[PDB]
Design an enzyme around this catalytic site. Structure first.
Site, PDB file in Angstrom:
ATOM      1  N   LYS A  94      -5.741   0.239   2.658  1.00 47.11           N
ATOM      2  CA  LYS A  94      -4.490   0.284   3.399  1.00 47.11           C
ATOM      3  C   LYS A  94      -3.482   1.029   2.547  1.00 47.11           C
ATOM      4  O   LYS A  94      -3.524   0.979   1.340  1.00 47.11           O
ATOM      5  CB  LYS A  94      -3.939  -1.133   3.628  1.00 47.11           C
ATOM      6  CG  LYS A  94      -3.096  -1.252   4.868  1.00 47.11           C
ATOM      7  CD  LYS A  94      -3.893  -1.355   6.155  1.00 47.11           C
ATOM      8  CE  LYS A  94      -3.001  -1.517   7.352  1.00 47.11           C
ATOM      9  NZ  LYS A  94      -3.771  -2.087   8.459  1.00 47.11           N
TER      10      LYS A  94
ATOM     11  N   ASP B  68      -0.606   2.598  11.192  1.00 46.85           N
ATOM     12  CA  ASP B  68      -0.263   1.188  11.308  1.00 46.85           C
ATOM     13  C   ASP B  68       1.218   1.138  11.703  1.00 46.85           C
ATOM     14  O   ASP B  68       1.722   2.031  12.388  1.00 46.85           O
ATOM     15  CB  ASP B  68      -0.694   0.450  10.048  1.00 46.85           C
ATOM     16  CG  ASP B  68      -0.645  -1.086  10.087  1.00 46.85           C
ATOM     17  OD1 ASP B  68      -1.617  -1.663  10.616  1.00 46.85           O
ATOM     18  OD2 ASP B  68       0.419  -1.671   9.699  1.00 46.85           O
TER      19      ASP B  68
END
Ligand code: NAP
Ligand code: NAP
Ligand code: NAP
Ligand code: NAP
Ligand code: 2IT
Ligand code: 2IT
Ligand code: 2IT
Ligand code: 2IT
Lengths: 449, 449, 449, 449
Positions: free
Chosen positions: A111, A151
Site C-alpha cells: 500500500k 484508494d
C-alpha cells in the site's frame, strides 16, 4: 519502536483470530511466522516536491509499503489524504496481504500514498503532484514487482497520470498500475468491482444465515461514503432490488426521505459532485428532497435497517453505533472500507453473531476484495494482450467472491467455534485462511523456517 | 580440447542417426551445422561458497551450460550429484536441445548443477547451498533468458529456495524457474510429468508394435531409480493396470516377491524415505516383505519381464544387461533417465528391433520429455497469469507425448530404414526430427549459413 | 574433474613454494585458502561465430576466466592461439592473481582468449573476429569489473577493435581494456612495459648476486620469441649496453653471427615482419647475415651466454636446455613468457641457485609483471582523465619492478632458506608474497574464514 | 506524523541557531528551505532475515535514510545497536548533512543501520547478518549514489563483509563503502580520523580562547566511550602531551588513579577487549590498578579536569553533568559522539561560554567531522586509483579541521553575537555555515525556489 495505532489494531485483530483458533495446536511451527510477517519486506518514504497554481514550491511525503511478496508482486492502492502516515499505510498493507491471498490470484500485499490533500486542489495541481509522485516511485515498482492502483483520494485521473509518467520514464508500456483507462489496458468492471463485490458477498451471507429463506430483495441498506466503493455498492444494491437509505461524506450524511430510498440518478448526481471534489451539501436540491445531517454518520440516523455497508474509511463504526445498528434491526454488516468497524464495533458484532440477534460482520479483507481481484484480472488481461467483456469480468468477480466466502466458512468450521447461533465467524475465517496460505508460500520461498 | 566422454557419447549417437540417414542426401547444406551446434552458445562455471552446520567454509563448483537458444530461452534442469562436471552437463544440455525441440514448445536447451552432494546434508545446509548457488547464477538467467528446474538431487525444496533467492535479488516475481510450488506459480502434474509421460510413450509403442492387439494392462515392468521419475512412472504403471516388479536406488534394488508387484502404498513409503535422503535398505519391513539385493540393478534379477524403464541415471543398462532383458522377455524399453542405456545396450536393442525379437528402445529425449513439456506449460500459465486444472495439464501432456511419437515414426519412415521387423527406430526418428527443427531455426536467426 | 596439465603445473609450483616454507607454521589457518582460491570465481566460455574473406560461416571457442577479485577487478590478457583451452587459460589466470598482487596496484586476476589462429588470416578477418569475440564478452566485463588487454596473438589492432565494439555496444567510453591507442586512453610505455620490466628485474638480480660488483653492461643475452615481450626486451638490453645473441619464433631461431649481437634496426625489421604475421625465415637478408636454425630454440645454440630471457610461451625451456644454459655460462634467467621454464628446468635452476654455479631464476609472475603494472597505470590515467609522460610512466614501472624484487627477497628471507650459495629464491618469494596478500584480502571480503 | 524525539532534538538545535541569527534578516528567502530540507529525500526500511549459530531463523529491521544529496552522493555510517529506529537515524542523517557540508568535500548526508545487537553474537553470526543486510541494501547504494561506512556497532569487519557482498552482487569493484581494508581501497588514517580530528579541533579552541597563551600539553581530559572514536581520541591526546583521566563503556567508567593518566598500552588493552565485544570490567588488572565505577559516566567522577570529550553516544552529558564539569574546571568540550550533549547540557555550556567561566562547546557536526572527511578522502583515492601516505592523509585531515573551525568562527561573527566573554558560538557557527552551503546548492539543483 514507534506508536502505530492503526497498524497495531489491524495486527491485533488478525493475530487474535489465529491465536484463539486451533491453528497453532495443529501446526505449532506457524507461531514462528508472526514476528517475521509483521515486519514489512521493505518500506519506501520519499519527498514529493511539486508546484502549485500560484508557482509556489510545495512538499508532501510519499510512501510505498511493500509488505509481502510470497504469493506475487506487491499489490495494493495509493491513498491521498492528509491523515496518511506510515502507521495507516502499514495497517492497509498488512490487511492487503491476506485479502490478496483470499482472491486466489498471484498478488503480494502493499500500500502507498501521500499526505497530499486533493481537496481544494485544481485538476492541474493534481496532475502535477501525480507526476512528481511517480518520478519518486518509478524505480521501486513494475509489472512483475509492485503494481499500484487507486484508494482514497486516488481516482482514474491520478492513476492514469501515474501510468503516463511511468511509461515515459521507463520507456515501456506495461501493466505497472491497474485501474487504467479502457483505451490503455483497463478492465471492464474495475470501477464497479469493489462495491459490486461487497454486495455479492452480502448475498452469500443472507443465503447462509437464512438457510435460503430470504434474498437481498427489499433489504434496507445504510451506506457510508460517497466515492468509488459507496457509489457502486449503492448502484448494485438498487439493481438487486434493495433499498438504499443513506449515503455520506466527510461533511455529513444524506438520509433518504422515501421508503423507496435513493435512486440511480441521485447516485449519479453525487458521483458528479465528487468528480469535482464537492460535498453532498453542495446539492441544494438533494438536500431539500431528502434529510441532510451536517457532521453525522448514517448509522444512528437511518431508522429501521437490515444491512450496513461502511464504505468510507477506517474506524467509522463505533461500538455505540454497532449496538444502535442492531437495535435498528441490522443483521448484516459488510466492510467496503478497510477496517471500517472499530475494534469495539467488531466485538459488538461478533458477540451478536455468537449469542445475540445474530448480526453478522464480514471483514473488509473478504468483502472488499472485489477491487483488487478485478485488478488481478486487469494484470491477466494485460499479460494476455486481451480485453475481456463486462459479462466475462463480472462472472469472474462473482466466482472469486463466492470462493472467498467458501474459504472463510470452511476454515472457520475447521479451526474455530461458531457459538450458540451456529453462524461461523467471517472475521476469523478470512484471517486464518489468508494467513495459512501466505505462511505456506513464505516457507517455500525461504522467508521463515 | 578436453576428455568429455559422456558428451562424446551423446554426440556420437545423435550424429550417427543423422549421418546414417538420408537427411544429408536430401539437405547437404545441413552438414555445416554440426561443428557449430556442438559448441555451446555459452558455458558458465562459478565457485559456490557456503557454510555447513558446523560453521565451516565450504566450496563446490556450479555450472550452467546454455547450449542452444534458437527455439526459445535456454531450458533444462539442475543436477546436484558428486559426479557432476562439464562433460556430464554438456551431454545433458546437448540432449536437451533436441528433446525440447520435440515438445513443440518454445524452449532452447541448457543444463546446470553442482558437484555438491545432498547425501548426508541437512535441509538447512541444502537451503543455504541453494541460496548461495542462486547468488552466483541469478545474473545469467531469467524468465525470457534461461529457465531452470530440478534434475537429479534437485527437489521442489531446492527449486523453491532458488526461486525465493532470485525474486529477492532481482526484485521481481516471474517464471524464472519451473517445478514451483502450487502457491507460487507451479503447475499441476509437474511432479508426475516425466514418469507419466514415459508410460504414455510406452502405450504408443505397444499399440504400434502389436498393431493394436495388446495394451499396457498386465505388462510386467522393471523400473530402476526411486526418485521423481521412477516414483510417478511406477504409480502410472499401477494406474494403467501394469505390474511393477522392481524399484531401485544407488545402494541396491527391491524385487517384488508377489506376481501383483509393488503397490501404491509401497511407492509412497519409498517417496517418504527419499524425502529424507534415505535408502530403500532403510525400510526393514519393505526388505523383509520383498527381495532386496544390495549393490544390484533390476535388470538381470527381475525374472520374466515385458518392459524396462531405466529411471535413475546415465549408462545404467550395460550391453550384457540389455541382452539379459531380452532373454527375460523384455520387448519395450523407454528411458526415463537421460542416456540411461549404454552405447552397447543401444546397439543390442536396435539390433533386436531391426532383426531379432523386436525389443524396442525409446530414447530419453523422446520418452522423458514430459517433464520439460509440463515445464513449458508452467511457463505458459505464468505468462498467462493462470493455473490450469490437473485434467487440463495431463491432457496437454498426453497430446505432446503422442505428437513426439508421431514425429519420431514419421521422420524415421521418411529418412531411415526399419529393417526386417518393420519397427521404425525411435532413436533415429527423435534425433533427426529434433535436429532438423533446431537447424532450421538456427539458420533463420543467423547461427549458421 | 578434467585433465588440466598446465593448470596443475602452475598450481603445483605455487603450492610447493608455500607448503615448503614456514608460512603455514606461522599462519596455519591459511591452509584453508588453497581449495577455495584454486576454484575460479567464474569461468565463461562462448561460441564465437564469424565470417571469413570467402564468406564462410566460421566458429571458434572464446573464454574468460575470472579467477580472483579480492584486490580489484579481474585483470589479464587475451590469447589467440590454436592451443588455447580452459587448462591453459586457468594456468595463466591463476598466475595472474599473484603477479597482479605483486604490482601493488588494485587488480584481480583473470585471463581469456580463443583457439582462433591469427596465422594466415587477413587483417579484415582479424577485425571481424575481434568484433564477434567482443559481442560475446561485453556483458561480462567493464572498467570496474574485468579489464582485458593483449597476450599472445592479441595486438593493439585487436585490442582497439575490441574497445571500439565495446564502446558501441555499451554506449560508453571508459577504461574497459588496456593496451589502447595513445589517441584513445592509451599509456606511454605500455608496448615496451613487459620487456623493459624483465630487463629492470635482471638488473636487480645482477646487483644482488654480485653484491654490486657487476652491471648488465656487456652481458650476453639469449632471447626467445620475437613478439611484444621479446622485441622490447631486446631493445632495452641494447639500450643498457648488453649484447643480444638470439631472437626466435615458432619456426626457428636467429643466432647473431657477431660478438656485437643484434642491433636495433634488426629488431625493428623483425617487428615489421611480425606485424604482417610473417616469420624470421622470411627475411632472406637477416638469415644470410646471421645464423638461422630451422626448428630450434636458442638455448643450446647461442654459445657462451650470461642471461636467458624466455619471451615466447610456456614450457619453452626443457630440463636439458636448463643444464646446457648453465654449462654455457648462464647465471640469470628471467621469464618474459608466462611459465616459460618447464618444471624440470625450474628444478635445475633452483638447484643451481641453492648449491651449484648459482644460476638464478626469476619467475614470470615477478619478472614479466611490468606489462600488467603499466596496464594498471593506464587504468589510473583513464580514471584521472590524464595522460602521463613516457618518463613518468617508465619511472613508475621501474619503481614497481624494484618493489616486486624487494617483496620477493624479503619474503624469501622471512619464510624460506636460501641454501649454500645464500641466493634467495625469487620463485618462492614471489609465490609466497603474492599468496599472502591475496589470502589476506580474501578473508576480509568473506571469500574464506 | 510520529514521535521522533531525537530527530526533533537535533532539528530544534539547528533551527534555533539559524532563527536566532541574522541569517533570515539578510536572506529571508531561506525560510522556505526549512520545511523541505527537514523531509528526507528518501527513507528505506527493510526486513533483514538471517540465521544464528543454532540454525534459528532470525529477523531484524534495517534502514537507510538518504537525507540530502545537494552537495554529493549520500554519505554516512551504519549503526548496529538495539536502540536503533527511524527517529535516531533521522537525527544522525540530518546532522550528517551539515557536517558533510562543513568538510568541503562533495558529500550528501545519510545514515542507516539496524536494531541488530552485536553483543553476545559470534563473529560468524555478525558476518552472516552483515551479508544479509547488504543483500537488502545493495540496490539502493553505489559509489556515486550512497556510500556507507561504520558507526556504533559497525567495525571494519562488518564494513568489509558488506563490501564483499556488494562487489559479488553487483559484479564490480568500487568505492561503495569507506572504512575499507588497506588491501581493498582503504585509506591510511581512516580508523584514527574521528578521534584525531576531535583533538585537532580542540587545539584550535585552546589557541583561540587563550589568544595563544596555552596549548593542549598537560590538559586533563575526560573521555567517555571506548570504541573507534574514544580509542584514537585518547591515543592522540597522549601523543600531544595531554593526560587521559578516563575511558568508559556502556557498563561503567575507568578513572585513572595516577596524575599521569592512562597510557597507550592500556588503550590498546581496551581496544583488544572491544574487538571481542567485552567490557572494561572484564580486565581484572586494569580495574585493580585504576578506579572502576560500575554504572557511571566519567563526568562527575574524574576530579579536576580541563577538557571533556563525549565519544560514546547521544545524550550522554546531562545538564547536571555539564554544570559539574564546569565546577571541576572544564573549559573545553568537544563532541566525538553525535549529539553527545543533551539539550540541557548545550544550554549550560552556551551560557558558560557567553557569560560564565567561558566553557566552550564544539558540536559533533564540526568536531567529529574528521571521520567522514577521511572517508571523502578514501573516495578520492579510490577514484584516482591511488593510496596516499599516512602523512599525506593526516595533513589533509588537519587542514579540513582547521577550515571547519575557521568557517564556524567566521560565520558566527558575521551572523551572531558572542556575548560578554567574546567567545563565538561554535554551535551556531557550524549550524549556520553548513545550512547556508546546503541551501545554496539545493536551490541550484531545483530542490526549492
Ligand atoms: N477503491 C478500491 O478499489 C478499494 C478496494 C477495497 C477497499 N477500499 C476502501 O474503501 C474505502 C473508500 O475508498 P474509495 O476508493 O471509495 O475512495 P474515494 O473514492 O476517495 O471515497 C472516499 C469516501 O470516503 C470519505 N472519507 C474518506 N476519508 C474520510 C475520513 N477520514 N472521514 C470521513 N469520511 C472520509 C470521502 O468523503 P469526501 O467525498 O467528503 O471526501 C468519500 O465519500 C477505503 O477504506 C478504501 O481503502 C477501496
Ligand atoms: N526430473 C525431471 O523432470 C526429469 C526429466 C527428464 C529426465 N530426467 C532424468 O531422470 C533421471 C532421474 O531424475 P530424477 O529427477 O528422478 O532425480 P532424483 O529424484 O534425484 O532420483 C534419482 C534416482 O536415481 C538414483 N541415482 C542417481 N544417480 C545415480 C547413480 N550415479 N548411480 C545409481 N543410482 C543413481 C538415485 O538413487 P538414491 O535415491 O540412492 O540417491 C535416485 O533413486 C535422470 O537421468 C534425469 O536426468 C528427469
Ligand atoms: N604482452 C604482455 O603484456 C605480456 C605480459 C606478461 C607476459 N606475457 C607473456 O609473454 C609471452 C609472449 O607474449 P607476447 O605478448 O610477446 O605475444 P606475441 O606478440 O604474440 O609474440 C609471441 C611470440 O612467441 C612465439 N610463440 C607463441 N606461441 C608459441 C608456441 N606455442 N611455440 C613457440 N613459439 C611460440 C611467437 O612466434 P611466431 O612470431 O612464430 O608466431 C612469437 O614470436 C607469453 O608467454 C605471454 O603470456 C605477455
Ligand atoms: N566512527 C566514526 O567515524 C564516527 C564519526 C563521527 C562520529 N561518530 C560518533 O561517535 C560515537 C561513537 O562511535 P564509534 O564509531 O566509536 O562506535 P563504537 O566503536 O561502536 O564504540 C561505541 C562506544 O560507545 C559506547 N556506547 C554505545 N552506545 C551506548 C549507549 N547507548 N550507552 C552507553 N554507551 C554506549 C560503547 O560501549 P560498549 O563498548 O560497552 O559497547 C562503546 O564504548 C557515536 O556517537 C558515533 O555516531 C563516529
Ligand atoms: N485499494 C485497494 C486495492 C487496490 C488495487 O486494486 O490494487 C484495496 O484493496 O483496498
Ligand atoms: N530435468 C529435465 C527437465 C527440467 C525442466 O523441466 O526444465 C530433463 O528434461 O531432463
Ligand atoms: N598479458 C598479461 C597482462 C595483460 C594486461 O596488461 O592486463 C600478462 O601479465 O601476461
Ligand atoms: N559515522 C560517521 C561517518 C561515517 C562515514 O565516514 O561515512 C559520522 O560522521 O558519524
Amino acid at each position: 519502536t514507534p506508536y502505530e495505532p492503526e497498524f497495531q489494531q489491524a495486527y491485533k485483530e488478525i493475530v487474535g483470530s489465529i491465536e484463539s483458533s486451533k491453528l497453532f495446536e495443529v501446526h505449532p511451527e506457524l507461531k514462528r511466522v508472526l514476528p517475521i510477517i509483521s515486519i514489512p519486506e521493505r518500506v519506501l518514504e520519499f519527498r514529493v516536491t511539486w508546484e502549485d497554481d500560484k508557482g509556489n514550491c510545495r512538499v508532501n511525503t510519499g510512501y510505498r509499503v511493500q509488505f509481502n511478496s510470497a504469493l506475487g508482486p506487491y499489490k495494493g492502492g495509493l491513498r491521498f489524504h492528509p491523515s496518511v502516515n506510515l502507521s495507516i499505510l502499514k495497517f492497509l498493507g498488512f490487511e492487503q496481504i491476506f485479502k490478496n491471498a483470499l482472491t486466489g490470484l498471484p498478488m503480494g500485499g502493499g500500500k502507498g500514498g501521500s499526505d497530499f490533500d486533493p481537496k481544494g486542489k485544481s485538476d492541474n495541481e493534481i496532475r502535477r503532484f501525480s507526476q512528481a509522485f511517480m518520478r519518486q516511485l518509478f524505480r521501486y515498482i513494475g509489472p512483475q514487482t509492485d503494481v499500484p492502483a487507486g484508494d482514497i483520494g486516488v481516482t482514474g485521473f491520478v492513476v492514469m497520470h501515474m501510468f503516463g509518467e511511468y511509461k515515459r520514464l521507463r520507456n515501456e508500456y506495461s501493466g505497472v498500475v491497474t485501474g487504467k483507462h479502457m483505451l490503455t489496458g483497463g478492465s471492464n468492471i474495475r470501477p464497479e468491482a469493489t462495491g459490486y463485490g461487497v454486495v455479492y458477498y452480502v448475498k452469500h451471507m443472507i443465503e447462509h444465515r437464512t438457510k435460503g429463506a430470504e434474498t437481498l430483495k427489499g433489504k434496507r441498506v445504510a451506506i457510508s461514503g460517497s466515492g468509488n466503493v459507496a457509489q457502486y455498492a449503492a448502484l448494485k444494491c438498487i439493481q438487486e432490488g434493495a433499498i438504499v437509505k443513506s449515503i455520506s461524506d466527510s461533511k455529513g450524511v444524506l438520509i433518504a426521505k422515501t421508503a423507496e430510498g435513493l435512486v440511480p440518478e441521485e447516485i449519479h448526481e453525487i458521483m458528479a459532485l465528487k468528480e469535482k471534489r464537492a460535498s453532498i451539501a453542495d446539492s441544494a436540491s438533494l438536500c431539500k428532497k431528502h434529510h441532510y445531517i451536517a457532521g453525522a454518520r448514517p448509522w444512528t440516523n437511518v431508522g429501521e435497517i437490515d444491512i450496513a455497508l461502511p464504505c468510507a474509511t477506517q474506524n467509522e463504526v463505533s461500538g455505540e453505533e454497532a449496538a444502535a445498528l442492531i437495535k435498528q434491526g441490522c443483521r448484516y454488516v459488510a466492510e467496503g472500507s478497510n477496517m471500517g468497524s472499530s475494534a469495539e464495533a467488531v466485538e459488538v458484532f461478533e458477540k451478536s453473531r455468537a449469542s445475540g440477534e445474530g448480526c453478522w460482520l464480514a471483514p473488509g479483507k473478504a468483502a472488499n476484495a472485489g477491487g483488487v481481484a478485478v485488478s488481478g484480472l486487469e494484470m491477466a488481461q494485460n499479460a494476455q494482450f486481451s480485453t475481456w467483456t463486462h459479462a466475462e469480468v463480472d462472472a469472474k468477480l462473482a466466482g472469486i467472491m463466492q470462493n472467498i466466502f467458501e474459504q472463510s466458512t470452511d476454515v472457520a468450521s475447521k479451526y474455530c467455534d461458531s457459538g450458540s447461533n451456529n453462524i461461523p465467524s467471517l472475521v476469523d475465517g478470512a484471517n486464518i485462511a489468508g494467513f495459512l496460505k501466505v505462511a505456506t508460500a513464505m516457507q517455500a520461498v525461504g522467508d521463515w523456517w
